[PDB]
RNA sequence: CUUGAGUCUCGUAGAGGGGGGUAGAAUUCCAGGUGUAGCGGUGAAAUGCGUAGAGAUCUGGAGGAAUACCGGUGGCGAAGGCGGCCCCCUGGACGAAGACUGACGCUCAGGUGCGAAAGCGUGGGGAGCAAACAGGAUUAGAUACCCUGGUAGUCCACGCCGUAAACGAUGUCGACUUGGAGGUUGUGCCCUUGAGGCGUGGCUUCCGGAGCUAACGCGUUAAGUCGACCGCCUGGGGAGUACGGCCGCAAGGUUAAAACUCAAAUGAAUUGACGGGGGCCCGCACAAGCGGUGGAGCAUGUGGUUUAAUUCGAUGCAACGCGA
């Protein structure tokens, strides 16, 4: 896929920063 | 931990500098029994020449060569869990760890007083007896047997 | 044989094997060793121990040239990254600098599909 | 302690069941079945009630230990399949092996077998035969399998599905030749039962004449290779062709003859004929 | 008539679009030098590559594809989407101060245009990737993940296809309605001393009041209070299927039912089991030791054999020197 891991990593944007 | 500290400096034995004899009983101090061992070592070695046929001068450390371990168990936190990971025996625990478990089974194993236990249990090592030697037979279970996961 | 006395050590570290080579300033190889070529075999024996064994074997093979100072280059990751470094340093060698030359791509070619295990 | 029973089931005609099989089915506590629902319907037709266990090849081994534990507890387990008898292209090998190695009695029962039923009415020598089951679904694999058994002198039994009958027949024509005699037995013990024997080319042509003739389940009986030694070994010819591709013709023929220990003149003539 | 909507002047940011150039890294291949038995892969292997010299290292060359760092809940675009740098052509938006036209406006069935990826037609290109496929391994045999290769496809020019969980599951436009914390672009004033303070715009992220909501939750960027217009829905399955019409080279797309059958289908949220998602706290649970059982002979008791009985009960964690 080579794109799903990028989306998964970007999902963590809202983990604890905002 | 970032850095590690070594062992605490301890003065030697003025009599003969026998660290093994001092560590045999110091770790086992209880109920002020140090005086008993201090007064018993000389009295025992005075008559041990005829009691066991040998003097506790050069034969006191001739059946303890196998005591010195090569691998020891260390609780190390790796992979998010504790594990043994047997590494080379560092001087911190190469002898102290093995020495602390010698009188753990030869303390009151058939005498009413420690007058003859301490000397006899070690003198019997010259006659394929004793327990300090066989203690090393248990550390091999977790060392050189699980190299796939260690 | 040429007694150049100066060279550079190239290390190629991989998840399955490690390669150590010695060359001169003009890129001319003189000796090499590999973890799989030093008695070890299989990924289960690709530990840094095999890497240091291969480094020691390469050092022994190249000692004939009388090299003393080496510049060491690291290529890619792998368990045998620092083990090879210490193994070759201990074999009577004067380290100069550690250079990381891993070929990082600037998103040029699509990487192979990743494993699902 | 309890024994395992290998009880065959009808191959399409309910009336083709044995009385002992019915008694065993009613006399056991658990029935391991390929598809519980199917067996359940069959049991209902005979008015038999018992426990059903989903045992198929996908989870065979996984549940083999559980079945072994149940048997050791003194229970009696009967193994059945959707049709015919178990262990013949049907689940049961791992369970039977585990039971045998664990010291558990195995009681087989006679019953329907599609291959045997087809062979009985095949009209071909039955003294010796080789059962091969299904053929590879891929063209390359099917061709390789057919080539491997081209020289087999014994009668060959194969299983076949309506989905790939035409392709399998075409592959057989290409590999074994249209001169071979083949018998196709379809829908045995059913209303549309039909057994037709003919040369492979004639058979194929007849089958293609109507789609109705390739519907249902099928069994193929292939006459064994004839006892003719005039033809030279095929491996020598293949080696000669490969060496010709890689090396000159004369050296290729000499090397092939040397390795295979056969006359060089015949190989050279065959190579020249093929080249021409 | 000028407030709505537009035009002119100045300036601002922008992966907005089309076309042409060019730069660096990397992969693959070709060739040369040094060098010599392994390399590659895996949980372990094997297929594969290598003495006609691989892999490693160096030094040239060819080619295609994509633009590491910057890079950000950053920016632009009506949507789909848009990331090296430069040039040419070109669209939109915003801010200061004016001048101008004077309702020129909003929404839109049909209609027209645009429209991810896959796919199709013609002709090129093809490094890496990769459906299909081949082989290896695994299995009694399979399938399935796993490994080695590998063809379309992926790229370009033209034409067709017009479908997505094409989503913010929120149609477009306008007005009114408590507040905080940011980000990003303007602009006016105070010593811009500067980063700052005072204000005034556009876009955008988070929390939250009234209000709303089945609840979740939304909350000035509304799912709040209203107004204009358009599209769409009224049980679940049948079914976005059949027939017909239109479109298409094809794949198919669009419009779109009925018979028959069920008494449910469904949304939100609550309570507990489950759990390995996880984290945490405990208990010789584990860790580190002490002593035993299992090793051998006895005694007791149990399971079984025999017997006329070897009475019966517990006989997985909760029985076997137990009832007794
Ligand atoms: Mg079925
Ligand atoms: Mg079956
Ligand atoms: Mg642009
Ligand atoms: Mg512009
Ligand atoms: Mg173009
Ligand atoms: Mg290049
Ligand atoms: Mg925008
Ligand atoms: Mg006027
Ligand atoms: Mg319309
Ligand atoms: Mg495309
Ligand atoms: Mg096609
Ligand atoms: Mg095309
Ligand atoms: Mg083409
Ligand atoms: Mg295969
Ligand atoms: Mg693959
Ligand atoms: Mg490949
Ligand atoms: Mg749609
Ligand atoms: Mg989208
Ligand atoms: Mg929608
Ligand atoms: Mg919800
Ligand atoms: Mg809110
Ligand atoms: Mg609502
Ligand atoms: Mg309905
Ligand atoms: Mg349709
Ligand atoms: Mg139609």
D53 φ/ψ angles, rounded to the nearest 5 degrees: -125, 125
Q: What are the CA-CA distances from residue D145 to residues D80, D152, D170 (Å)?
A: 30, 12, 14
Is the distance from CB of D253 to CB of D267 less than 8 angstroms? yes
Length of chain D (residues): 276
Ordered by start, the domain boundaries in chain B are 19-146
Is the distance from CB of B24 to CB of B118 less than 8 angstroms? yes
Ligand lying closest to the C-alpha of residue A7: 18
Minimal CA–CA distance to B146: which of C16, C51, C44?
C44
SS3 category, D106: strand
For ligand 7, the distance from its centroid to the CA atom of residue B24, given in whole angstroms, is 80
Minimal CA–CA distance to D137: which of D180, D107, D168?
D168
The 3-class secondary structure across B35-104, one letter per residue, is HHHHHHHHHHHHHHHHHCCCCCCCHHHCCCHHHCCCEECCCEEECCEEECCCEECCHHHHCHHHHCCCCC
In this structure, whether the domain defined by B19-146 belongs to CATH 1.10.455.10 is answered with: yes
Name C residues 12-51 whose Cβ lies under 7 Å from strand E: 12, 14-17, 19, 21, 23-24, 26-32, 34-37, 41-44, 46
Q: What are the CA-CA distances from residue D88 to residues D14, D56, D236 (Å)?
A: 20, 13, 36
Distance CA D2, CA C26 (A): 80
Q: What is the resolution of this structure in A?
A: 2.4
- In A, minimum Cα distance to C109 occurs at A2
Name B residues 75-104 whose Cβ lies under 7 Å from strand E: 75, 80, 84, 101, 104
Which one of A1, A2, A5, A8 would you mutate to disrupt binding with C, by most C Cβ within 10 Å of its Cβ?
A: A2
Is the distance from CB of B21 to CB of B13 less than 8 angstroms? yes
Distance CA D23, CA D208 (A): 45
Minimal CA–CA distance to D193: which of D16, D39, D9, D37?
D16
The b-or-e profile of D244-266 (16+ CB within 10 A means b, else e) is beeeeeeebbbebbeebebeeee
Take residue D113 and report the two structure tokens written for it: 């077998």
The b-or-e profile of D152-189 (16+ CB within 10 A means b, else e) is eebbbbbbbeeebbeebbbbbbebbeeebbbbbbbbbe
Is the distance from CB of C75 to CB of C12 less than 8 angstroms? yes
Is the distance from CB of D96 to CB of D138 less than 8 angstroms? no
């Amino acid at each position: 896929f080579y794109e799903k891991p990028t989306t998964e990593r970007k999902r963590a944007k809202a983990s604890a920063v905002k | 931990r970032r850095r590690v500290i070594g062992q605490r400096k301890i003065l030697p034995d003025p009599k003969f500098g026998s660290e093994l004899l001092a560590k045999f009983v110091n770790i086992l101090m209880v109920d002020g029994k140090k005086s008993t061992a201090e007064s018993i070592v000389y009295s025992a070695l005075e008559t041990l020449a005829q009691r066991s046929g040998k003097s506790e001068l050069e034969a006191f450390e001739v059946a303890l060569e196998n005591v010195r371990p090569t691998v020891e168990v260390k609780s190390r936190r790796v992979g998010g869990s504790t594990y043994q990971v047997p590494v080379e025996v560092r001087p911190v625990r190469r002898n102290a760890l093995a020495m602390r478990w010698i009188v753990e089974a030869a303390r009151k194993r058939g005498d009413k007083s420690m007058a003859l236990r301490l000397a006899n249990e070690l003198s019997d090592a010259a006659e394929n007896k004793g327990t300090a030697v066989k203690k090393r037979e248990d550390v091999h279970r977790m060392a050189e047997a699980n190299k796939a996961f260690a | 044989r040429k007694q150049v006395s100066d060279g550079v050590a190239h290390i190629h570290a991989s998840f399955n094997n490690t390669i150590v080579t010695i060359t001169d300033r003009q890129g001319n190889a003189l000796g090499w060793a590999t973890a799989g070529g030093s008695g070890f075999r299989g990924s289960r024996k690709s530990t840094p121990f095999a890497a240091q064994v291969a480094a020691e074997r390469c050092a022994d093979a190249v000692k004939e040239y009388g090299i003393k100072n080496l510049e060491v280059m690291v290529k890619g990751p792998g368990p045998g990254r620092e083990s090879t470094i210490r193994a070759l340093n201990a074999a009577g060698f004067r380290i100069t600098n550690i250079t990381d030359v891993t070929p990082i791509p600037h998103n040029g070619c699509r990487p192979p599909k990743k494993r699902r295990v | 302690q309890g024994q395992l029973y290998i009880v065959p089931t009808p191959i399409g005609n309910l009336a083709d069941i044995t009385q002992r099989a019915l008694e065993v089915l009613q006399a056991v506590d658990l029935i391991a079945a390929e598809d519980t629902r199917h067996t359940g319907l069959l049991l209902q037709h005979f008015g038999i009630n018992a426990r059903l266990f989903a045992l198929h090849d996908h989870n065979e081994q996984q549940k083999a230990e559980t079945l072994l534990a149940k048997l050791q507890e003194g229970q009696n387990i009967a193994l059945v399949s959707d049709a015919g008898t178990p262990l013949i292209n049907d689940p049961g090998y791992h369970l039977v092996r585990t039971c045998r190695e664990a010291g558990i009695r195995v009681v087989p029962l006679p019953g329907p077998c599609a291959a045997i039923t087809a062979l009985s009415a095949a009209g071909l020598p039955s003294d010796r035969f080789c059962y091969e089951g299904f053929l590879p679904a891929k063209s390359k694999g099917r061709r390789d399998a057919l080539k491997a058994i081209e020289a087999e002198p014994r009668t060959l039994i194969f299983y076949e599905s309506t989905h790939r009958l035409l392709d399998s027949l075409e592959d057989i024509v290409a590999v074994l030749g249209e001169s071979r005699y083949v018998v196709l037995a379809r829908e045995l013990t059913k209303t549309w039962e039909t057994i037709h024997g003919a040369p492979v080319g004639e058979l194929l042509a007849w089958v293609k004449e109507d789609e109705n003739r390739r519907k249902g389940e099928m069994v193929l009986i292939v006459e064994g290779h004839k006892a003719q030694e005039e033809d030279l070994p095929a491996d020598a010819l293949r080696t000669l062709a490969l060496l010709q591709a890689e090396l000159p013709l004369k050296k290729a023929a000499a090397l092939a003859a040397e390795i295979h220990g056969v006359k060089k003149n015949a190989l050279y003539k065959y190579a020249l004929e093929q080249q021409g």
